[PDB]
Design a protein around this ligand. Structure first.
Ligand SMILES: O=c1ccn([C@@H]2O[C@H](COP(=O)(O)OP(=O)(O)O)[C@@H](O)[C@H]2O)c(=O)[nH]1
Ligand SMILES: O=c1ccn([C@@H]2O[C@H](COP(=O)(O)OP(=O)(O)O)[C@@H](O)[C@H]2O)c(=O)[nH]1
Ligand SMILES: OC[C@H]1O[C@](O)(CO)[C@@H](O)[C@@H]1O
Ligand SMILES: OC[C@H]1O[C@](O)(CO)[C@@H](O)[C@@H]1O
Ligand SMILES: [K+]
Ligand SMILES: [K+]
Lengths: 781, 781
């Protein structure tokens, strides 16, 4: 039935040479098409699952995505019956012709990691995506099972393992699997007799004689389980045993965390350009980590003092902050300090703030300087290094290589998905965003790291219909620069989902009166309802009694708050029902950020266009997380709602924050919030691409709530539960330390294979990143 | 021996901060020392093994080389007993301080090809150096023994094997080892009965039925063996069988040879800048190669017509030459042609000759055009591509990648060894020699190719005392650019020694009278003995009856012709015994080559300084090999000798030519001739660094020869027999075709592992070569 397909195919051409997302790809052609559809059936499934379609004059190329992480590419003749299967490289040719007019010159670069990763087989099952350690535990457990040469790495590992000159686990006396096998048995025999609560100090003398150093446990009971797990691993390995053992071995003492860009600090920062959830995440992370690290250290019978350092930039000139000081104790922790190192060039240190899109030329020297400073601060080298975002992941990768430390990376966001078609359109965007530097770093850190943590499944593989954040890096091209044929694989065993949370001392249900912070109510009321218009707040709320539609975020284009303002301004029904309150941007000072400055001008116009005075309150950056918690709960009092209208949102901590306070939430369906919220149950999804619908959806909510105030309560509970089940810090740390254990061991078992990748990556950094990063215009004081 | 040892490092550290050379390094120290020479204990064995030593005040660094192919680097304390073993990369660190003042930026590029070669085990035996095919054969032979998943590749090979639309060996009717085994057997039984000389045509009908296509042999006998061999590979694989069979499969039909630089032609060229033994080598090669290819095509029952294309630059302004015509038939061949393609830019084609040192920016476009052209010339694609020197090897790799063809490289020289310390001092030599480009190319091709051909062992691994040419590329560094930690390995199984020869119809014993070409006597006698001084010959021989000390070569610095002249001018004894005749440089025209110009001036000066007139004849480039053959024979008549005083000579075809004609040779001990000649037996060695001794050795020889004439004859015979045994063209062809067969099959079996190394190279060409070559300033017409 070709008379039909050609209908759709001639639909596509009318659009002309260009990119088409499934948004349009199906939208225009299938539904906006005449009843000639009469389709269902085959080719509807195919078209529906098509992720994007590249239209050039004679042909349309289709990237088809049947299942998450499964792709096939196709060229079809616009007017013709012909359909040919494209290879990934071939499809990317198309994209390139669309822009340069020409596919990349024959000997232009193809990045291919596929042949490197081939060391260990790939899972094909949806169930292991974001579960990679489970896959690895099972593969190690098999490789280890009765293989002499296979067990040795474990022995050597334990035998060399030490911290600060104090030997741990096994001593130099155990040279082979028999001696070890023997000692473990003698030790189990001895220990099996003594009382459960017997301290390690009692039998310590005996152990040292037979070659057993500290770290097996604090008391006899614990030590015995350890030694049994090990006998079991030498004997009949199984995944749970392997994981349990490797996780329990004391390893992580000194931790190094990289977060160079933005103003990273504990006060007077959140809401400035580049300063946001990542900062909030890390501060919550180390506190939890330190608590867990102490616990384990003790349980294993050790007195070691842990140290966690957060490496960021020293910013001499940002007044009102502590960003100027080299060392800062993290609030509410004993062992976590922030360690600030300055950017510099031959001419000396660079004072001024620099956008995260511009920091590339400063990162290498930063790595050098950082290694020195943490060397001054740490006693013994780092046992774990975690990279954060692009710059951090970059720096974290260089250090991990330099010092030989187990590496983890966390994206926190991936710009290629926040800025659609920014890969194929990279060149027109470069003077401004330098995405050629950043995509390079991303691709680099991504394959350079030992493991990767994501906050959600969708961050890796997306959903059934839409592609993941990482998955979108599998095949792309930057025409004129290079072409990534396989840059990452959603099925990679290194991906682990470990979900964060909000700090339950700061954020809790609005309904616990005892804990409500009333001392903030005077300020909050002035902040919302006052009649004064100034750099802190603009316009004025006429009716103090309505529900409040609330939002808070950095002000940049993707966050798309100006968009919400418009949706709101246009909808008379929604303006009638509720007041709009938007926290974003800091109007106290001159904005040095491109998008934010731009975004502020829109905001000012929108205020005039829709005559927003009386329904709208535009608040500047709210920098105190403690008062912020109260603010949310106050929105709760008005029986209002939180809305997150981002064009794309990588994770969305504020979504978690509101749900946690019991504030019903409407979040963008693009990115992480799609996973966080179960629509109808834990809150509602809205599409930033249809805003008027978004507004009407909200109007519907406030109307239902008016007629039935219990509707409100339903979602508030739905949300609260979702958070209890899904996003909380208690479990996070333990997961992290265990991951660190397993991948740490895997690192040695698999070292021989990863040398080819080691050197490929080295060359990529040296001959691609460095040149690009050096071409970036330097900040001038 | 703590007393003695302290005493050497003592004298060493006085020399200052500089390069320690072995000859230099040991010379001063041990011999300029005392009876402390009682060091004939262990420490001395390590000193003479030292290849070079880096001098920096606190430490000295030593590269030690116990056996060829085995290096260990170490640093002891300038004043101390401390000796600490160095990683190769740390030794190279040392070398980098000496120049730039500090090491290479911490994150600047290290090339390591080691982990990319691991697909197969390294031979550790001196016996296997240059013998790699023998080694690769025993690996295949073993991997091929009763591993089904192993044998399939051989079947796929024979099944897919075809040429020019005609199907060869196995048909598509054979889908598996089972029916293959069945058919072959069925074929054996039948053929075993027929008369030996029965033509394939007779039993062809039957064969086509059972799945057997042409190529097994011309008669029943030959088909019988070929089939029996294959049956054997399926049953009990052994190296002799594996090789013998893979060599028999008709394979090489179309051959592409790359030689872009120089004036490449059959006349009016030899002696011009860059135009030399490579050109002479290649013409002899294709002629020989064509005879074998026809022979092999006939024997396997095929009628295919071969094609050999020699690809070089088209030079439209080189007059007197054929260098401006796109296609030229090679002398004395049916199927070999020179194919010339022009260099060009956006601006159009580039007419003027460019030094081989400057060709780099044009080579990539050369490849594209070349491909288009050799495509028009060839029926089907290349079955083999052979690269030559640096530019040729660079182009040959790009082509083999683009076309998917078996690749072989032949160095012909490696400049890094011709220009001492040109790697470490590369920066100041670069605006002139562009060695950053070249060395990059050299390493790129060296690893990129399937197999490598060398003319001698020394070219690869050197000698026990001295380092080999490729071997010197194993670890080196170019401060500020990159560091090669492992660039090549002398034991790599891809190395193969196949020695060239002289064309026996041009060069032969001076004592076969019927053959002497006497029609050349008048011209030659004028050349040597006339009293006319002009651009053809300078100065004058006063005495026509003295023996002639003879040399012929391109005129450049490394050839050190000016050196020979000085030595001779200074030595009254030698001047008394013989006349000096030197052919080099073309003074008919104005020289456009740097080194030639510089070298010409030296020559002129030496003429006046040593008042050489009457003892000396300086002859311009002799471009006709035919008469050139006679010129050698004529020197023999005078009972003269050939002398080759190069500072380094990669091979020395003129040494082969001289020995072939009966002319006793004295050749430089640096480079290939060290292997060609057996001192005292087939000729003599002289050390260009001690030239006065060179001059005396010559003097001694002539004196002895005057007292006992039969002394001359001994060497002449030694020289002849030596040539007969080692260097002759007959064997060359077979070996080369067999190599292609074996390396060809291997290409398929080992492809998966080579996939990693394939991308490493691609990125290295792309991000390192391309940018450098583009830095090279273009020629201007
Ligand atoms: O003016 C502001 C804007 C943001 N935030 C905090 O910054 C974080 C933003 O995290 P999210 O992931 O939602 O946004 P992003 O990380 O992209 O900045 C949340 O803790 C907010 O409460 C804040 O305290 N004040
Ligand atoms: O004026 C000259 C100089 C060189 N040759 C020939 O060029 C080749 C030089 O090759 P060789 O390997 O000796 O030195 P290369 O030029 O390759 O460095 C030999 O065949 C010489 O006979 C020549 O015919 N005329
Ligand atoms: O979305 C990317 C941006 O958001 C942050 O979370 C801000 O704290 C960082 O990851 C980055 O600046
Ligand atoms: O260095 C040797 C030089 O001479 C050649 O043999 C050409 O005659 C080339 O290999 C190179 O240009
Ligand atoms: K230990
Ligand atoms: K075939």
């Amino acid at each position: 039935n070709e008379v039909l397909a050609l209908l759709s195919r001639v639909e596509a051409k009318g659009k002309g040479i260009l990119q088409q997302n499934q948004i349009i790809a199906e939208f225009e052609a299938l539904p906006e098409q005449t009843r000639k559809k009469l389709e269902g059936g085959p080719f509807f499934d195919l078209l529906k699952s098509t992720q994007e379609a590249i239209v050039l004059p004679p042909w349309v190329a289709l990237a088809v995505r049947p299942r998450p992480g499964v792709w096939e590419y196709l060229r079809v003749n616009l007017h013709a019956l012909v359909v040919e299967e494209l290879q990934p490289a071939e499809f990317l040719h198309f994209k390139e012709e669309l822009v340069d007019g020409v596919k990349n010159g024959n000997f232009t670069l193809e990045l291919d990691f596929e042949p490197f990763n081939a060391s260990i087989p790939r899972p094909t099952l949806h169930k292991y995506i974001g579960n990679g350690v489970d896959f690895l535990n099972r593969h190690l457990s098999a490789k280890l099972f009765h293989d002499k040469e296979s067990l040795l790495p474990l022995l050597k590992f334990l035998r060399l393992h030490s911290h600060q000159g104090k030997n741990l686990m096994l001593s130099e006396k155990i040279q082979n699997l028999n001696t070890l096998q023997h000692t473990l048995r003698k030790a189990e025999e001895y220990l099996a007799e003594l009382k459960s609560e017997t301290l390690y100090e009692e039998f310590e003398a005996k152990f040292e004689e037979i070659g057993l150093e500290r770290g097996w446990g604090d008391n006899a009971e614990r030590v015995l389980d350890m030694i049994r797990l090990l006998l079991d691993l030498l004997e009949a390995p199984d995944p749970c045993t392997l994981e349990t053992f490797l996780g329990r071995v004391p390893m992580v003492f000194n931790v190094v965390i990289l977060s160079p860009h933005g103003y990273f600090a504990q006060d007077n920062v959140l809401g400035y350009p580049d300063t946001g959830g990542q900062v909030v995440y890390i501060l919550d992370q180390v506190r939890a980590l330190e608590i867990e690290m102490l616990q384990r250290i003790k349980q294993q019978g050790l007195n070691i003092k842990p140290r966690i350092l957060i490496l960021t930039r020293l910013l001499p000139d940002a007044v009102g902050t502590t960003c100027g000081e080299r060392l800062e104790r993290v609030y509410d922790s004993e062992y976590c300090d922030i360690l600030r190192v300055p950017f510099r060039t031959e001419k000396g240190i660079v004072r001024k703030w620099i956008s995260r899109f511009e920091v590339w030329p400063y990162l290498e020297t930063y790595t050098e300087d950082a290694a020195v400073e943490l060397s001054k601060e740490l006693n013994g080298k780092p046992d774990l290094i975690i990279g954060n975002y692009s710059d951090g992941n970059l720096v974290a990768s260089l250090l991990a290589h330099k010092l030989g430390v187990t590496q983890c990376t966390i994206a926190h966001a991936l710009e290629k998905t926040k800025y659609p078609d920014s890969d194929i359109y990279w060149k027109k965007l470069d003077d401004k965003y330098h995405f050629s530097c950043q995509f390079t770093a991303d691709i680099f850190a991504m394959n350079h790291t030992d493991f990767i943590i994501t906050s959600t499944f969708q961050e890796i593989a997306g959903s059934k219909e839409t592609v993941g954040q990482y998955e979108s890096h599998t095949a792309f091209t930057l025409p004129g620069l290079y072409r990534v044929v396989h840059g990452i694989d959603v099925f990679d065993p290194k991906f682990n989902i470990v979900s964060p949370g909000a700090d339950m001392s700061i954020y809790f249900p609005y309904t616990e009166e005892k804990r409500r912070l009333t001392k903030f109510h005077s300020e909050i009321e002035e902040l919302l309802y006052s009649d004064v218009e100034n750099k802190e707040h603009l316009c004025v709320l006429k009716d103090k009694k309505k529900p409040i539609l609330f939002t808070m975020a950095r002000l940049d284009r993707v966050k798309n708050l100006s968009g919400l303002v418009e949706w709101y301004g246009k909808n008379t029904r929604l303006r009638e029902l509720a007041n709009l309150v938007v926290v974003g941007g800091d109007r106290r000072k001159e904005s040095k950020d491109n998008e934010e400055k731009a975004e502020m001008k829109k905001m000012y116009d929108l205020i005039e266009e829709y005559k927003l005075n009386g329904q709208f309150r535009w608040i500047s950056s709210q920098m105190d997380r403690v008062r912020n918690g109260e603010l949310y709960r106050y929105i709760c009092d008005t029986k209002g709602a939180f809305v997150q209208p981002a064009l794309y949102e990588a994770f969305g901590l504020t979504v978690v924050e509101a749900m946690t306070c019991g504030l019903p939430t409407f979040a963008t369906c693009k990115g992480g919030p799609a996973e966080i919220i179960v629509h109808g149950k834990s809150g509602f999804h809205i599409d930033p691409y249809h805003g008027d619908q978004a507004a009407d959806t909200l109007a519907d909510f406030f109307t239902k709530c008016k007629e039935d105030p219990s509707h409100w309560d339903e979602i508030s509970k739905g949300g609260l539960q979702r958070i209890e089940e899904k996003y909380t810090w208690q479990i996070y740390s333990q997961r992290l330390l265990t991951l660190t254990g397993v991948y740490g061991f895997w690192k040695h078992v698999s070292n021989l294979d990863r040398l080819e990748a080691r050197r490929y990556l080295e060359m990529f950094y040296a001959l691609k990143y460095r040149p690009l990063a050096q071409a970036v215009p330097l900040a001038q004081d």
